[PDB]
Design a protein around this ligand. Sequence first.
Ligand SMILES: Cc1ccc(C(=O)Nc2ccc(CN3CCN(C)CC3)c(C(F)(F)F)c2)cc1C#Cc1cnc2cccnn12
Length: 273
Amino acid sequence: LPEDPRWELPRDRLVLGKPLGGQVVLAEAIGLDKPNRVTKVAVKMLKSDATEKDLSDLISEMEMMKMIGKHKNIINLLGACTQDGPLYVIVEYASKGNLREYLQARRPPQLSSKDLVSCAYQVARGMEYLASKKCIHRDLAARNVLVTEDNVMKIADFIDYYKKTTNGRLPVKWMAPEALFDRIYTHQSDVWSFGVLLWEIFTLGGSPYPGVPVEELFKLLKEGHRMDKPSNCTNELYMMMRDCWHAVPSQRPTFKQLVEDLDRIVALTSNQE
Ligand SMILES: Cc1ccc(C(=O)Nc2ccc(CN3CCN(C)CC3)c(C(F)(F)F)c2)cc1C#Cc1cnc2cccnn12
């Protein structure tokens, strides 16, 4: 592994902490920039039984993050430890966890309608930036959105159709029909995923199609079935979800259009309830 001086951080500057979920740990970086300050960071490293391909996957992930560049609404690369020891990929720390967890914790036994629209605007803004960088996410969902201490949404990324997430959810439930059935991945298939993410925001971390297995989901998709309008969701925001879920990919709005519409909606959405 060659030392990249734009990103390299000496090992003696990284104080490894508690695991966050290869494997991700919380850590403290001494002098990432003054040199006398600690910055809380998240570090990705390989698990004890990692393969040669697991290592090559972490390298390529790091190399891609280097090319994407900085944005307020994406989890940004901060550094790396590549010399004389295991590969550490260092990113910004998001203290309020993933957006699914963030939302569920703030359900009534708090977030206004304007905060929820702002959440959707921020994710759309991060997606617009990734698209401008010629990137396709493939796994956009609230679990892949991180929330910082200051409530900033940051897009992140942590195949068998039957494999479930830790929470017991099926990732096929976020996939556009053409991505699922024809293996065609585009910004248009990501916009379909963003529609499922809007539904997740407005149900405050609700699970899409609960109890629906893969074979039954395929049937719902073939029939042109669409998820119901969440409670406390405007007609305009439900039409946005439905447009994101257009059967014809060219007819779906783009992230650029979604940012413009969400920007306008945020400004007209009240923070009084
Ligand atoms: C350590 C770490 C390493 C890497 C990444 C990461 O997100 N990598 C990433 C890889 C690829 C892509 C884009 N591609 C998608 C695939 N696609 C096919 C090509 C384009 C992106 C993206 F943001 F751009 F989307 C990100 C996140 C973390 C974290 C963390 C962290 C911070 N706070 C907390 C709090 C709790 C838990 N974790 N945590």
